[PDB]
Design a protein around this ligand. Structure first.
Ligand SMILES: CCCCCCCCCCCC(=O)O
Ligand SMILES: CCCCCCCCCCCC(=O)O
Ligand SMILES: [Cl-]
Ligand SMILES: [Cl-]
Lengths: 153, 153
């Protein structure tokens, strides 16, 4: 991944987000409700030290689980680390959309986050543009009804 | 779907094809190996009367089944009917790629077929252009190894 947000101000990503689209290098990373990278972002909670707490939903064992993880800052404002993985922030306008990618050490999943439960065509175009450079083999997007449901069911 | 092949000569689609990419209006139409529209085209066998016999693979009950169906001609050269559905041929150059869609009566799945087990970037661009007009919520594509395996496993 060679696209990062220049000048990212992590404090201004605080608050509510919706996983409007997802994409991944391998079909099995997103194909089932219980696939490893099928994660629905709910809320971003930046810390004063500049770590990113993430609230998300994940389907585990026929149930939509509410989950929490800390992404630790690095020397690069647009790149965080997660234990189990790099999180890279590609692009955001803070008020409407955020594009990000997660990568292990060849598995890659990226999302288009939006602030409201609405299909934002401009944000999906930028998402689409950013993926043109990436070896993606699965793409999902969700309608506004799914965006307001637990695990987008 | 409002894109059909003007002047389609059904006889010249005869022979070998590979399902390089698939897309569908609903995630559950393509998300599992056993999803209803997860069909891998193998061979097209036009009949003299101008019907289209289709050989395809489908994963049923932990097994890759070899299957056969007849798409009946209509008054439109680019549109066929299948019992269980309209099949529409959007675009083909006969020698390299064929784009088609299947629709019931709101469910819609489209494929990019190629002649050889190769990622044809030009054909994927046209596939991408044709889908811009369609309400797709899932896209898959397959690498050359998967293209040469039963059910693209
Ligand atoms: C602005 C960055 C958004 C990052 C969201 C990443 C989601 C973390 C998912 C971790 C997977 C898991 O813990 O099961
Ligand atoms: C040029 C047209 C290509 C058409 C291929 C259609 C595939 C048919 C799949 C039917 C589904 C089923 O019978 O289970
Ligand atoms: Cl999209
Ligand atoms: Cl594609």
């Amino acid at each position: 991944v060679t696209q990062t947000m220049k000048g990212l101000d992590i404090q201004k990503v605080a608050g509510t987000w919706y996983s409007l689209a997802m994409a991944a290098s391998d079909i099995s990373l997103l194909d089932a409700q219980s696939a490893p990278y099928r994660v629905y972002v709910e809320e971003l909670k930046p810390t004063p030290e500049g770590d990113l707490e993430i609230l998300f939903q994940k389907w585990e064992n026929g149930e939509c689980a509410q989950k929490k993880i800390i992404a630790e800052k690095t020397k690069i404002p647009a790149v965080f680390k997660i234990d189990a993985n790099k999180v890279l922030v590609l692009d955001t306008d803070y008020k409407k959309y955020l594009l990000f990618c997660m990568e292990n050490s060849q598995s890659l999943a990226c999302q288009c986050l939006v602030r409201t439960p609405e299909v934002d065509d401009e944000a999906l175009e930028k998402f689409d543009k950013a993926l043109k450079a990436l070896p993606m083999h699965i793409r999902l997007s969700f309608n506004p009804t799914q965006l307001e449901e637990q695990c987008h069911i």
